[model samples]
Target chain A: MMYKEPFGVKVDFETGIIEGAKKSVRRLSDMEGYFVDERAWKELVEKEDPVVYEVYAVEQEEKEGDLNFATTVLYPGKVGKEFFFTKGHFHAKLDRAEVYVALKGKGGMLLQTPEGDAKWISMEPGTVVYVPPYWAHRTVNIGDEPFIFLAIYPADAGHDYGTIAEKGFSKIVIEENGEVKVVDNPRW
Target chain B: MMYKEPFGVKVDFETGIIEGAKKSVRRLSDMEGYFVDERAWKELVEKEDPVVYEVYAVEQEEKEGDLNFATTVLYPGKVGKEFFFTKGHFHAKLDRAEVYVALKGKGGMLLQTPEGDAKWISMEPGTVVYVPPYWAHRTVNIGDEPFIFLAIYPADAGHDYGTIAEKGFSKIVIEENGEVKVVDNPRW
Candidate 1:
């Protein structure tokens, strides 16, 4: 009537890396060139060096349920003056919401609606930000350290990156006068 | 189309106390006295101090979903060499499974079945233990520090503590010869 399976593994909150996890990296070169400073892309290309900007991950085996969980690390760095970020997405399951809890470092969550409404929230250790259904959200690392957070969402809420890929977030986060700022995205 | 709600406040993992949280405590006195060693219970009573074993909590307003999430802190202490723990439960929805992630401290997950089956898993920071459906589970703090963990389960899988209340776990975890041990529960 009872069964046991080992599920716990060590996680380095500082880097959002799980010990014994299947790992992968996302480099700046992987993003649409328009998202970053054109100059930064040239430098990266001329130097034949790719900058790793984020780490996407899941711990242990994926479970069967209505909810699913994972962790993400946006490494501290920049593409010109823009902070590293994820190509935000809207869930294919549009009615599903999501929750993100800051486990380490500092950052901002950029959320937008299909009609161009935009909002951003400051993220710090212990901060919990709830993403209601219909928001296309992306995380941006604004600190000098890796920004880490745990994400819990409906298991069926699959990612749909194409929307943002085509139209992009209405706003973008970048450094201004040595401080973080959100500004209108001319491209959008 | 997008909205945000900050849930739960900051938690002092070291104390299992959440500042700004509507919190509640569960003391050993809350349980049937026979669940613990006679001498331990007597000493605790004569000392006029009931051990606060666990803090049960929910942060922010309840959200709409078929799954629910919360955090628990098991205070570090002992009763006649027995560690502090949660009065475990079987799900009223017996087909639902549960997951526990150790946010801080160290402990063991005591799991059982109505048929007298039992098992325990080592827990440390970042450890994730998945409790398969049909198993009754409780957490025990076996370390000198408070234990903190996050729990995720189906919202419809309401807890059935009455089963465990009438018949305690088939096994109990205790310290013996300077080593942690799991022994059969004669009370069961």
Candidate 2:
């Protein structure tokens, strides 16, 4: 009995921006405790607040059954040895899952559970990653180009960013000796 | 406390194929009575039962809150003036919504409510169409190449294909003298 109207939006894969979608910009100044290199993170923030990642999302009804789709652009760079990444989050709704489809650039989807289980799924153009419920998910750009991906999840799957802010992921992606590596986060 | 394992799959945009995903094929012979031009439909089925569309999907826990994503390929061709389209369906759980993101070629998403209200949105590369709850939806390929799109919806949103089979959509996409037209389906 409830038939809502349909709609469409255009997407630019290069910039990972969907024209008409609301933008969520995460500046280096905002990712307070996410980066591994505190010395480099503070220096970068002092130089200027550069945008680390941007989310262009179309939000529908924010309830358990409705859905939302977004294009996340994680800009490429390194804070010391750690690459630029998103401040990840677990769904506040706990059991709400999500998927990310890589559209441009290369990187990895860093995932971890509250219990310390971890995973790193390679992100290249054409990769479809399923982030099961209860996992804290983040994106890391390991290449020189921006890591762009399309994310689909439940509209009401609220983000529990505070949980990640306190205990960061058990694993962190870094560039060691000019090579990418997923190793233990000493801080965690 | 449950941490499901995350996984990734490769998507081939050109062929609308996703490696490691399940395929749902809808052949011309399988479409019992969804087309307007029965004469043309029967003739095409008699000679060759070609695949009208294929859905490459990864279905995860199918119940109220889980999610699923898929690539749908509606091949280009016409049965009489009516272009080949998917046998549209309403969600068995009527309140479940869905999204279709065009990846290749061009087409239109035909949507209608059970009360006879209807709508159509153009589909081209990078176009995202959101199908709200309660609408019966279908896809029509209006170009020379296959119309490919990625669909994300509730895994438990079972398909009620019989509704469209019996009442067909009020509007249908067709080719008229080499041009595209969305006219009332006389059959409907």
Give the per-residue Cα lDDT of candidate 1 at A163: 77
Off by over 4 Å in 2: none
Put down candidate 2 lDDT per residue, B49-160, tens digits, no spaces: 8999998989987866678999998999998888889888999888788988899998989998889788989988988888988888999999989999889899888889
Assess the local accuracy of residue A186 in candidate 1 as a C-alpha lDDT between 0 and 100. Answer: 73
Docking quality of model 1: it rates as: acceptable
- Candidate 1 runs further than 4 Å off: A1-6, A33-39, A42-56, A59-67, A113-116, B1-9, B33-39, B42-46, B54-56, B59-68, B95-97, B113-116, B154-156
Clashes of each: 2, 0
Complex DockQ per candidate? 0.36, 0.80
Query: How close is every model to the real structure, measured as TM-score?
Result: 0.84, 0.97
Per DockQ, the best of the predicted structures is: 2
TM-score, B chain alone, candidates in order: 0.83, 0.96
